[PDB]
Design a protein around this ligand. Structure first.
Ligand SMILES: *[C@@H](C)/C=N/c1c(NC[C@H](O)[C@H](O)[C@H](O)CO)[nH]c(=O)[nH]c1=O
Lengths: 264, 96, 239, 188
């Protein structure tokens, strides 16, 4: 199959404003949210019907318990970071853990933290160490690296457990995740400011979101600037994007092993 | 370091006046998480507005999708009003 | 680390009971297990952090309260004989690897239909055989704790007022005096071996002490014999 | 689902013993080895999550994730090593599944056996000084009480010995008739 990923995020907010949770934890398979938990609901809930349909109540009940523990731990860790930095008021703490199953069968794993939305600690599962961005992160790194059992446990979770969870979830959501919805592509030609013609290459209705679009002048890649539009969710499970140039021109689109040419 | 939201207003399908569609407002790249998003039709708030939960990016910023069913017309001006800490007053982003 | 009380308890069928547990390790995770012969520890209830509790494998007949971050109580609402077991409280910082589980000292609970068979032990000391002293130049004193019920005893040896471990052997399990009876009473033996010359010295005092865990002052007693309360029963010997 | 470890293992003091543990769980988040002395609380010995052997003194812990198996190795066996060894695994949902445990019995190395049956006084029979290969059988009569063999260690003398006690309401000459007692047994 194509490359797929499993990730879980955690967000801790010290001193939240009214109506903002103190703790949120959300899971994703690729671009799809799969699970959700916050300090308000205090429950782990499915975010995909295929997650709800395939995991029995005991899964949700068990993880709700673990998340209530993780919630408390996150708060304590943000308080310790704030004291180290000597910061008052509202500050954020974040975590992203995950893995990828590449098309070739090879795998990647990641575990990282942020303080006020900036990189804080990066786990290196290959050297079994933490990369500290500053002196406070260094204090944490020294404490965490002294726990050898935790470093080893983490590498096994990243490399083995995560990949097995990803494979399980991929099977559950195969009708959503493993499908292909090809793009509908068009080219729009227009004279803009007098003398300057803009050519837009617009694609929509596609799934997965990963799409390559470029512009070529006589079979060779452009030497001028191409403006790229972001891959945006249309709201129906499909995506849209574009690529434009000014000025023999052709738009090239690659999506899920299928290549397309629109000669202008 | 606080990051202001990128606000992108676009239709689900290529838009044609008089033909039923969906207007989307994709709000992304913001930090911290507290945000207020409204969809407006002629400067007036649309009540029937569906939205995604707060979403997390690998760069630590957040994103959301706010949408509503609509039939575009020459007379109607559709917009997305966003407020965030990085903004002094709400930012009104008009649909192109 | 993990402090739990009581070490021993005798309950009548239908009595309510509370086992207390405290940890001062600033741990989030807390557990109540029961340990029974032939099987691994069975989780009754657990508490992932303060403010949360959930059922384990065997929650029926039990309830819990995570009172605060330090304390996790286990309650038996209406004691039943199947709840006769050894209960362990445990704690850990978190569930992930890199967090060791710490256990309490254990709580042995005996649940009986009635207390009319609770008996403290009869403790006797048997002096070394003169044939052994001649044959080996060593002297073995034997201690017997007989007729006790339930099996809630701790035997110790004291030579000249000081507890000894060297040259001591206590049976790991007691022996059923009435093997056919459901409520058979128990007998436990222990040996203390010294050199012949050590035993031959008069001024050398040997005491076999048996701590029995029975009824408390709060338990009702309506039998003609003495109330079989927690007590120390002992037998002594000299050279 | 399943954690399997032998019920009991018997080895000789000064020797080596390997306590096996195979697990068949839904996911794996590490394996623990705990030691539990009779009437005491379990205490942590090791935690293994990656493949290989960890050596902590006389004790070693090995893990093979592909084989779903671990072992606890005890070298230079001592009488104090007689305990129950508990195998535990955290599954994909972090549930700590505990094995039934392995009771480890250590046979003392009996240097100079001197089998004998002695009559004591306050009646009790003492069958002592026999080799570790001798097995003491339970009583046939309900009014006769026979304990199993017990090992005592006279530390000051570097001496260890086995013994079994018998008593009733009966003589010492016929007390251990149901057990296979040595031909050289001394009867005063
Ligand atoms: C339901 C399975 C939700 N899980 C969840 C997790 N799960 C991943 C993993 O077990 C955990 O992150 C450990 O801490 C890794 O050592 N993680 C998370 O952050 N949020 C969740 O909702």
């Amino acid at each position: 199959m194509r490359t797929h990923s499993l990730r879980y995020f955690r967000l801790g907010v010290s001193d939240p404003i009214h109506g903002v949770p103190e703790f949120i934890s959300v899971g994703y398979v690729d671009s799809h949210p799969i699970t959700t938990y916050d300090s308000v609901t205090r429950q782990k809930e499915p975010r995909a019907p295929w997650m709800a349909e395939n995991l029995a109540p005991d899964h949700w009940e068990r993880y709700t318990q673990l998340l209530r523990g993780w919630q408390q731990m996150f708060k304590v860790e943000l308080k310790r970071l704030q004291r180290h930095y000597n910061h008052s008021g509202s500050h954020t703490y974040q975590r992203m853990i995950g893995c990828e199953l590449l098309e070739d069968g090879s795998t990647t794993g990641f575990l990282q933290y942020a303080y006020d939305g900036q990189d804080f600690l990066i786990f290196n599962k290959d050297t079994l160490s933490w990369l500290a961005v500053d002196n406070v992160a260094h204090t944490i790194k020294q404490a965490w690296e002294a726990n050898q059992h935790e470093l080893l446990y983490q590498k096994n979770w990243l490399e083995e457990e995560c990949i097995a969870w990803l494979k399980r979830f991929l099977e559950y959501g195969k009708d959503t995740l493993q499908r292909t919805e090809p793009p509908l592509v068009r080219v729009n030609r227009k004279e803009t400011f007098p003398g300057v013609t803009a050519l837009f290459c617009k694609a929509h209705g596609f799934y997965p979101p990963e799409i390559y679009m470029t512009w070529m002048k006589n079979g060779e890649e452009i030497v001028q600037e191409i403006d790229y539009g972001d891959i945006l969710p249309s709201g129906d499970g499909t995506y849209q994007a574009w690529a434009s140039i000014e000025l023999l021109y052709s738009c090239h689109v690659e999506h899920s092993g299928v290549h397309m040419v629109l000669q202008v | 370091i606080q990051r202001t939201p990128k606000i992108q207003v676009y239709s689900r399908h290529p838009a044609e006046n008089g033909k039923s569609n969906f207007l989307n407002c994709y709000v992304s790249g913001f930090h911290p998480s507290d945000i207020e998003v409204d969809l407006l039709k002629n400067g007036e708030r649309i009540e029937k507005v569906e939205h995604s939960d707060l979403s997390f990016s690998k760069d630590w910023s957040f994103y959301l999708l706010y949408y509503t069913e609509f039939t575009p017309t020459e007379k109607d001006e559709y917009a997305c009003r966003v407020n965030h800490v990085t903004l002094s007053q709400p930012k009104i982003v008009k649909w192109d | 680390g993990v402090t739990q009380t009581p070490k021993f308890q005798v309950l009548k069928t239908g009595q309510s009971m509370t086992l207390q547990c405290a940890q001062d390790m600033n741990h989030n995770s807390m557990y109540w297990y029961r340990q029974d012969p032939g099987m691994g520890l069975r989780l009754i209830y657990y508490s992932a952090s303060e403010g949360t509790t959930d059922k384990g494998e065997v929650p029926n007949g039990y309830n819990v309260s995570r009172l605060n971050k330090r304390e996790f109580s286990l309650r038996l609402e209406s004691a039943a004989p199947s709840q006769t077991s050894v209960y362990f409280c445990a704690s850990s910082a978190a569930v992930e690897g890199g967090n060791t589980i710490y256990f309490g000292e254990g709580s042995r609970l005996t649940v009986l239909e009635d207390l009319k068979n609770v008996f403290p032990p009869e403790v006797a000391v048997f002096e070394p055989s003169e044939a052994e002293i001649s044959h080996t130049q060593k002297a073995t004193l034997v201690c017997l704790a007989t007729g006790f019920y339930p099996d809630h005893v701790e035997l110790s040896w004291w030579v000249n007022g000081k507890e000894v471990h060297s040259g001591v052997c206590t049976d790991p399990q007691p022996l059923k005096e009435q093997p056919a009876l459901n409520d058979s009473r128990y007998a436990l033996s222990s040996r203390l071996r010294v050199s012949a010359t050590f035993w031959q010295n008069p001024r050398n005092h040997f005491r076999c002490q048996v701590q029995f865990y029975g009824l408390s002052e709060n338990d009702e007693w309506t039998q003609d014999r003495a109330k079989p309360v927690t007590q120390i029963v002992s037998a002594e010997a000299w050279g | 689902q399943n954690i399997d470890q032998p019920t009991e293992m018997t080895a000789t003091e000064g020797a080596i013993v390997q306590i096996n543990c195979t697990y068949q769980t839904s996911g794996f988040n590490g394996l623990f080895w705990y030691q539990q002395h009779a009437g005491e609380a379990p205490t942590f010995l090791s935690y293994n999550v990656l493949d290989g052997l960890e050596e902590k003194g006389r004790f070693s812990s090995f893990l093979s994730r592909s084989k779903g198996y671990s072992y606890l190795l005890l070298k230079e066996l001592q009488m104090k090593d007689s305990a129950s060894y508990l195998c535990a695994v955290r599954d994909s949902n972090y549930q700590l599944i505990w094995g039934a445990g392995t009771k480890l019995i250590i046979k003392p190395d009996i240097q100079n056996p001197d089998p004998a049956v002695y009559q004591l006084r306050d009646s009790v029979c003492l069958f002592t000084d026999f080799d570790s290969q001798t097995n003491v059988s339970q009583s046939k009569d309900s009014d006769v009480y026979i304990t199993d063999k017990c090992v005592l260690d006279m530390r000051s003398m570097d001496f260890k010995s086995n013994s079994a006690v018998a008593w009733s309401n009966f003589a010492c000459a016929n007390a251990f008739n149901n057990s296979i007692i040595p031909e050289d047994t001394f009867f005063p």
